[PDB]
């Protein structure tokens, strides 16, 4: 279990994926040309998880960049670290999907996906011990959501014994005005329930609320939002990328975090919350990190964890701090807040500490929760879906590409089934 193959699809997928690669390259001392320039060997111990060694002392991200829209990979190559990616791993169509899931999933996306599998197989067969795949995408658009889920299915067909992980950006009317985003999200969640092992729910609604309410940004941009996404992605992959006592990998994570196969949608949290590019004038304490981490203002999904119960929790602290103090804060948070942890999964909170903090922070903490409160996210989507589907608003966008109402009905049904089983386990007793 070492190599991960990263895939980024659509505008959102490629924007957050690029940011992810800038952020971890800086953590590992890799500059935009692929040369290592860091000071500590621990930057390189597990560097193969995300990077191939190209001869010439260089490191190339194991990353495949996909979009039906050609322009978004022109903007990747022009961003900082555009030059770090393998040029042949850019796979671009010449027409976007018009925020239309059926275009991404059935028609134009399906005409490009074999082009994508070419690159995916080459990166995979090169691996000594392939862990699996992580995909960044949004659920509200046409390419990330439709072609991204299609891609998942195709890859699962060829690599069914490998872990399939996603970072999936949920739509919010606060951030985008595209009215069919509830449709695309609901069609995609149907696909993700059946075909991924772990999905990090990154909620644009939560990201906007954090930027507006906590960071005091009157008009937050995708830059402001993606700063929070990239802090999360760095935190939740920290254990994969540095050597710890845990022999952390994607399958051990899934085994211990997912008690029921469909219930694999995690609520990420992070502390401290910062604005992008901003000097931090005081570090947070271990009790501060521990408390602020289980606080609804720090969740990357617009859900109050106190409205449900945790099935499982994985937490990672970064920086120089007492592991003793970390253990006593974590245990105390579980005892005082005993009623937000299901009692029929004993010892369901796991803590790791990595001595290396992220850039700009002396100390930080990242939170991976499998909470039954995540049903609030799916209910919000499902309500928005129904208000449109009652009227059959915009359906001809989809039937024009070959779909049928029945596929909408089923996806709506499957997400309401998801809500119910979250609720079933929320109300379940140990007697």
């Amino acid at each position: 279990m070492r190599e991960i193959v990263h895939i980024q699809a659509g505008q959102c997928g490629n924007q957050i994926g690029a940011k992810f690669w800038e952020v971890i390259s800086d953590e590992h001392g890799i500059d935009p040309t692929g040369s290592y320039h860091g000071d500590s060997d621990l930057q390189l111990e597990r560097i193969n998880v995300y990077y191939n060694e190209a001869t010439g002392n260089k490191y190339v991200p194991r990353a495949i960049l996909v979009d039906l829209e050609p322009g978004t990979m022109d903007s990747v190559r022009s961003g900082p670290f555009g030059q770090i990616f393998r040029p042949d791993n850019f796979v671009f169509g010449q027409s976007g999907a018009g925020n239309n899931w059926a275009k991404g999933h059935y028609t134009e996306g399906a005409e490009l996906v074999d082009s994508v599998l070419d690159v995916v197989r080459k990166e995979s067969e090169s691996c000594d011990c392939l862990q699996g795949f992580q995909l960044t995408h949004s659920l509200g658009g046409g390419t990330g959501s439709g072609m991204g889920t299609l891609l998942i299915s195709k890859i699962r067909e060829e690599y069914p014994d490998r872990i399939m992980n996603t970072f999936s950006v949920m739509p919010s009317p606060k951030v985008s005005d595209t009215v069919v985003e509830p449709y695309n999200a609901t069609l995609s969640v149907h696909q993700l329930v059946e075909n991924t092992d772990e999905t990090y729910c990154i909620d644009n609604e939560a990201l906007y609320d954090i930027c507006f309410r906590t960071l005091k940004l009157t008009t937050p941009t995708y830059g402001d939002l993606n700063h929070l996404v990239s802090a999360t992605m760095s935190g939740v992959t920290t254990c994969l990328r540095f050597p710890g006592q845990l022999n952390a990998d994607l399958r051990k994570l899934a085994v211990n975090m997912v008690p029921f196969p469909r219930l694999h949608f995690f609520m990420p949290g992070f502390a401290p919350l910062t604005s992008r590019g901003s000097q931090q004038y005081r570090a947070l304490t271990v009790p501060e990190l521990t408390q602020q981490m289980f606080d609804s203002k720090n969740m990357m999904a617009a859900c109050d964890p106190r409205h449900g119960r945790y099935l499982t929790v994985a937490a990672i602290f970064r920086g120089r701090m007492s592991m003793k103090e970390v253990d006593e804060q974590m245990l105390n948070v579980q005892n005082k807040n005993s009623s937000y942890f299901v009692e029929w999964i004993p010892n369901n909170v796991k803590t790791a500490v990595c001595d290396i903090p992220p850039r700009g922070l002396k100390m930080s903490a990242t939170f991976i929760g499998n909470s039954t409160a995540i049903q609030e996210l799916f209910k919000r989507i499902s309500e928005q879906f129904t208000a449109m589907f009652r009227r059959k608003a915009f359906l001809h966008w989809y039937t024009g590409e070959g779909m049928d109402e029945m596929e909408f009905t089923e996806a709506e049904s499957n997400m309401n089934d998801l809500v119910s089983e979250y609720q079933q386990y929320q109300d379940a007793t140990a007697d």
């Binding site: 059926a102 999933h105 059935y106 028609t107 399906a110 299609l150 299915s153 699962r156 067909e157 069914p160 014994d161 059946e194 075909n195 039937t399 024009g400 590409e401 070959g402 779909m403 049928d404």
Partner: protein
């Protein structure tokens, strides 16, 4: 008394002293073969006893063999039952794991047929 001379010899003499005459006038085998038969008969009883003793010790020897043999049969039966159990659960697990993977790839393939129906329905419009 009445003394009566009996004899006189070189190194002694003898006689008889009568104090009273009697009140009453007057006075009121195995062969060699037989002996050998009884000596031989006792020998054959000795030998029969020894033979029966040795017969009982022989019976104990064979019980010893049967005990040592039974322990070896138990060990062999332990091995045989362990072997058949393990092969049974290994093949059952293989069948299960292959059946799960085939169902998983069967569902994704129905999806693949359905995508062809979507693309056909489009050109039909």
């Amino acid at each position: 008394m009445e003394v009566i001379e009996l004899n006189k010899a070189t190194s002694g003499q003898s006689w008889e002293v009568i104090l009273k005459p009697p009140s009453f006038d007057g006075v009121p085998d195995p062969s060699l073969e037989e002996i050998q038969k009884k000596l031989e008969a006792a020998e054959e009883r000795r030998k029969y006893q020894e033979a029966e003793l040795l017969k009982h010790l022989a019976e104990k020897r064979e019980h010893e063999r049967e005990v040592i043999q039974k322990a070896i049969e138990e060990n062999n039966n332990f091995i045989k039952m362990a072997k058949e159990k393990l092969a049974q659960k290994m093949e059952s697990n293989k069948e299960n794991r292959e059946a799960h993977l085939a169902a998983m790839l069967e569902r994704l393939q129905e999806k693949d047929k359905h995508a062809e129906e979507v693309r056909k329905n489009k050109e039909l419009k």
